[PDB]
Structure formats: structure tokens, C-alpha cells
């Protein structure tokens, strides 16, 4: 495995997202800003990717999470569709945990998988492109939250999404 230092890619970010100056934190603003046009920019779903993706090996990072509904995070295949409304599902190229309806989910499809995992504050995401897995652990005790098994066929990026104005995600040092 290998610890990675990530920064958010502001050209992928939906123009409603508010990114911290240091490119670690993301929240949802009210209304879009007039940001420059790029094919990589999510124009409808409230998503942003890190600037660095991974094509081989094992990598991990940590994400600090808000306590209110609206976030989801994990990884996305590079080919995830950027223009138009997409489903937030594995078949559309996102593998993520989510806080929605007051509880945590692994976003499996067609039915999400509810978790019983206490309160999440910081989460370790561990991407293994050797065996084909993405796993999530609560940092404070390394308790296993969920593993998706996927034999990835392309470059995979850290993924963050915030669809409600009262919460946040932050890449954590």
C-alpha cells in the first residue's frame, strides 16, 4: 500500500461546489459560479475528483466527513460521465459511501447497503488495483466499513460529492 497526498481538481468540480483555497475541502454553495468550460467538469451532479488518479498499485488516503446529510465519497473510473445528470451508482462508475436520510450507506445498486458503523468522523479509503477492491475504514479504530470488489479496467480517481449545503468533505493530512 502507499499513502497519497491528494488535492481536488477545480476543473472537474461542479460549479456550485465551494473548494477550499488549499484544495482539500469541499462544500455546496447556493448557485453556480461562472467557471471556465472543460470536458472534465461535472455540469449537473455535485461532484469533484482529485487531480491524481491511479492506474496500478495500492493507494490510500483519508477523508474527514461532515455530520449532516449530503455527502458521498470514494472512487470513480475516469470515464464516469461528466455532462448531464448521471445516476450515482457503481454501473455509472462511482464506488462510494454516503450519508443520506440520517444514516450511512455503501452505494450499491439497485439497492444501497445500509451500514451499522457508529459515527464517522474520518475515513480511510484504500484502493487496491492489484486485486481489484476499494475499502473503507473508520480511522479512529480501523474498523472495516465496506469493500467493493471491482476488477478495474482504467484509471481510477478519488471522488467527492456534496449535494446539500449543510455538510462537507475534506481530504485530511
Amino acid at each position: 500500500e502507499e499513502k497519497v497526498e491528494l488535492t481536488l481538481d477545480p476543473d472537474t468540480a461542479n460549479p456550485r461546489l465551494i473548494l477550499s483555497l488549499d484544495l482539500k475541502g469541499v462544500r455546496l454553495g447556493e448557485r453556480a459560479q461562472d467557471l471556465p468550460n472543460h470536458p472534465c467538469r461535472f455540469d449537473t451532479n455535485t461532484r469533484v475528483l482529485a487531480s491524481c488518479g491511479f492506474s496500478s498499485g495500492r493507494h490510500h488516503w483519508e477523508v474527514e466527513v461532515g455530520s449532516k446529510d449530503g455527502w458521498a465519497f470514494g472512487v470513480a473510473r475516469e470515464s464516469v460521465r461528466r455532462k448531464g445528470l448521471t445516476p450515482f451508482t457503481p454501473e455509472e462508475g462511482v464506488w462510494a459511501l454516503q450519508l443520506n436520510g440520517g444514516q450511512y450507506w455503501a452505494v450499491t445498486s439497485p439497492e444501497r447497503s445500509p451500514l451499522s458503523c457508529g459515527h464517522l468522523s474520518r475515513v480511510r479509503v484504500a484502493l487496491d488495483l492489484e486485486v481489484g477492491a476499494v475499502s473503507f475504514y473508520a480511522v479512529e479504530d480501523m474498523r472495516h466499513l465496506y469493500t467493493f470488489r471491482v476488477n478495474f479496467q482504467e484509471r481510477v480517481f478519488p471522488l467527492f460529492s456534496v449535494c446539500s449545503t449543510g455538510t462537507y468533505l475534506r481530504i485530511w493530512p
Binding site: 455535485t46 449530503g70 445528470l85 454516503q98 436520510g101 449535494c163
Partner: peptide, 10 residues
């Protein structure tokens, strides 16, 4: 069935 409202844009 389906998502909550704002969650459709996740």
C-alpha cells in the same frame, strides 16, 4: 423508490 430530492444530484 429511488433517491431523496437533492440526493439525485449526488
Amino acid at each position: 423508490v429511488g433517491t431523496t430530492l437533492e440526493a439525485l444530484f449526488q
